[PDB]
Design a protein around this motif. Structure first.
Motif, PDB file in Angstrom:
ATOM      1  N   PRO A   7       1.701 -48.570  23.436  1.00  0.00           N
ATOM      2  CA  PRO A   7       3.088 -49.044  23.465  1.00  0.00           C
ATOM      3  C   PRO A   7       4.044 -48.076  24.137  1.00  0.00           C
ATOM      4  O   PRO A   7       4.329 -47.019  23.581  1.00  0.00           O
ATOM      5  CB  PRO A   7       3.436 -49.189  21.986  1.00  0.00           C
ATOM      6  CG  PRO A   7       2.579 -48.192  21.303  1.00  0.00           C
ATOM      7  CD  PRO A   7       1.300 -48.126  22.090  1.00  0.00           C
ATOM      8  N   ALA A   8       4.520 -48.417  25.330  1.00  0.00           N
ATOM      9  CA  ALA A   8       5.590 -47.636  25.928  1.00  0.00           C
ATOM     10  C   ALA A   8       6.816 -47.700  25.029  1.00  0.00           C
ATOM     11  O   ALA A   8       7.367 -48.775  24.777  1.00  0.00           O
ATOM     12  CB  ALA A   8       5.918 -48.162  27.326  1.00  0.00           C
ATOM     13  N   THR A   9       7.249 -46.535  24.548  1.00  0.00           N
ATOM     14  CA  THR A   9       8.309 -46.445  23.553  1.00  0.00           C
ATOM     15  C   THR A   9       9.653 -46.068  24.146  1.00  0.00           C
ATOM     16  O   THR A   9      10.660 -46.699  23.820  1.00  0.00           O
ATOM     17  CB  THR A   9       7.949 -45.408  22.481  1.00  0.00           C
ATOM     18  OG1 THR A   9       8.112 -44.088  23.016  1.00  0.00           O
ATOM     19  CG2 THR A   9       6.506 -45.585  22.023  1.00  0.00           C
ATOM     20  N   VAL A  10       9.688 -45.051  25.000  1.00  0.00           N
ATOM     21  CA  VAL A  10      10.890 -44.646  25.713  1.00  0.00           C
ATOM     22  C   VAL A  10      10.879 -45.320  27.071  1.00  0.00           C
ATOM     23  O   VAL A  10       9.936 -45.138  27.850  1.00  0.00           O
ATOM     24  CB  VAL A  10      10.971 -43.122  25.878  1.00  0.00           C
ATOM     25  CG1 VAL A  10       9.742 -42.595  26.613  1.00  0.00           C
ATOM     26  CG2 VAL A  10      12.228 -42.767  26.646  1.00  0.00           C
ATOM     27  N   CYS A  11      11.925 -46.085  27.362  1.00  0.00           N
ATOM     28  CA  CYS A  11      12.111 -46.674  28.677  1.00  0.00           C
ATOM     29  C   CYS A  11      13.492 -46.324  29.209  1.00  0.00           C
ATOM     30  O   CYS A  11      14.270 -45.617  28.571  1.00  0.00           O
ATOM     31  CB  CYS A  11      11.889 -48.196  28.653  1.00  0.00           C
ATOM     32  SG  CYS A  11      10.215 -48.797  28.157  1.00  0.00           S
ATOM     33  N   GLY A  12      13.770 -46.799  30.413  1.00  0.00           N
ATOM     34  CA  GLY A  12      15.010 -46.498  31.079  1.00  0.00           C
ATOM     35  C   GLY A  12      16.130 -47.387  30.602  1.00  0.00           C
ATOM     36  O   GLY A  12      15.971 -48.234  29.709  1.00  0.00           O
ATOM     37  N   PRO A  13      17.288 -47.238  31.234  1.00  0.00           N
ATOM     38  CA  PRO A  13      18.496 -47.888  30.713  1.00  0.00           C
ATOM     39  C   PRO A  13      18.387 -49.399  30.788  1.00  0.00           C
ATOM     40  O   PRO A  13      18.909 -50.043  31.702  1.00  0.00           O
ATOM     41  CB  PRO A  13      19.612 -47.343  31.613  1.00  0.00           C
ATOM     42  CG  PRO A  13      18.927 -46.882  32.851  1.00  0.00           C
ATOM     43  CD  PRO A  13      17.554 -46.446  32.442  1.00  0.00           C
ATOM     44  N   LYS A  14      17.649 -49.955  29.839  1.00  0.00           N
ATOM     45  CA  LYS A  14      17.512 -51.393  29.694  1.00  0.00           C
ATOM     46  C   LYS A  14      18.871 -52.046  29.473  1.00  0.00           C
ATOM     47  O   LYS A  14      18.963 -53.147  28.934  1.00  0.00           O
ATOM     48  CB  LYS A  14      16.573 -51.702  28.534  1.00  0.00           C
ATOM     49  CG  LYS A  14      15.108 -51.575  28.889  1.00  0.00           C
ATOM     50  CD  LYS A  14      14.232 -52.283  27.874  1.00  0.00           C
ATOM     51  CE  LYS A  14      12.850 -52.563  28.437  1.00  0.00           C
ATOM     52  NZ  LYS A  14      11.764 -52.170  27.497  1.00  0.00           N
TER      53      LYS A  14
END
Lengths: 49, 46
Positions: free
Chosen positions: B32-39
């Motif tokens: 699970p990708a947990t940290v993503c960019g400014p969604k």
């Protein structure tokens, strides 16, 4: 425990019997799909004496 | 037998080479990708 997740689905309800688990319906919603992704074969419980 | 570590001893008159430089190393880990960019997400109309 799937897809690299640990998978915990749950619910909270009462009972009014003496020594058993009951009949009667319900369903369990999720608690968490945990980002552990490990290998497990067995376990044990934990309980406070 | 000599001490392993030394002090820079920074002063206000430091030279560009010796001046102190903060560093921050960002390593990204995925398995699970947990940290993503400014969604950037948009505005809902209907």
């Amino acid at each position: 425990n799937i897809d690299g997740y640990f998978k915990i689905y749950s619910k909270h309800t009462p009972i009014n019997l003496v020594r058993d688990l009951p009949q009667g319906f319900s369903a369990l919603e999720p608690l968490v799909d945990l980002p552990i992704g490990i290998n497990i074969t067995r376990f044990q419980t934990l309980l406070a004496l | 037998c000599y001490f392993p570590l030394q002090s820079y001893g920074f002063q206000p008159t430091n030279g560009v080479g010796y001046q102190p430089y903060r560093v921050v190393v960002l390593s990204f880990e995925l398995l699970p990708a947990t940290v993503c960019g400014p969604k950037k997400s948009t505005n809902l109309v209907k």
